[PDB]
A = this chain, B = another copy of it.
Amino acid sequence: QQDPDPSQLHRSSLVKNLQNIYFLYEGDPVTHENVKSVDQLLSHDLIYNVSGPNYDKLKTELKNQEMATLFKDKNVDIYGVEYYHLCYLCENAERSACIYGGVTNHEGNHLEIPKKIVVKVSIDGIQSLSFDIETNKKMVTAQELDYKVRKYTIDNKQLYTNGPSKYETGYIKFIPKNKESFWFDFFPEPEFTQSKYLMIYKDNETLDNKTSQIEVYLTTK
């Protein structure tokens, strides 16, 4: 996946119920340390018995059978963006919370002191500023990072709000030490659902933090 073309980005002025992206990155993500799965719905997911402000049962669809059937009996660390509309867990379950990926092993992958990662932000060409985000992992999911990133740029520069977004075309770029960089679009198609936009966090993409760099390119229209 190579650098995006200016016509391939979705534009924030065509999205209708745009806000539905706000709450996602404004609210509190899901965080669980050293926990083990206990049952699964389909071959490619895993269910956990954990709680939060609006749930006591969680689900995370993974990339495929081979992956799910890998973390099935291991201890892992969860960190993910959740949705409540359109989420199934079990016939007998009200109060559910779905998510995509966000799964990392627990032992060894934890660090003593927080690694400092730097984000560079460009707007209309000009590189305008810099800020930091942390993490207690040697191998974090692009999900944990992308989130933390936006959170900041939403409560300060204002990436999303309960209404029209200030910018128009935005996307985050990951730059791994070994190879091939990738990106995510900051805005969805005209009409959409949450459950669908978040599928990007399906591949449970993980990467070393000690050697990865991030870039953000926004457009003021």
Hey, which bits of chain A sit against chain B, CB under 8 A? Answer: 16-17, 20, 23, 40-44, 54, 64-65, 83-86, 88, 90-96, 189-194, 196
Question: Which residues does chain B contribute within 8 Å of A93, judged by CB atoms?
Answer: 17
The answer for the CA separation of A13 and B218 in the assembled complex, in Å, is 51
Contact (Cβ within 8 A) B193 A94: yes
Main secondary structure of the interface of A (DSSP, over half): loop
| Copies of this chain present | 4
Q: Are B91 and A41 in contact (CB under 8 A)?
A: yes
Which of B65, B91, B94 interacts with A90 by CB under 8 Å? B91
A43-B190 in contact given A54-B54, A84-B84 (Cβ < 8 Å): yes
Point out the residues of chain B lying under 8 angstroms from A88, CB to CB. Answer: 91
Which residues of the other chain, B, contact A196 by a CB distance below 8 angstroms? 42
CA distance A29 to B155 in the complex (A): 29
- CA A91 to CA B17, docked complex, whole Å: 12
Chain B residues with CB under 8 A of A17: 92-94
Q: Are A43 and B90 in contact (CB under 8 A)?
A: no
CB contacts (< 8 Å) of A16 on chain B: these are 92
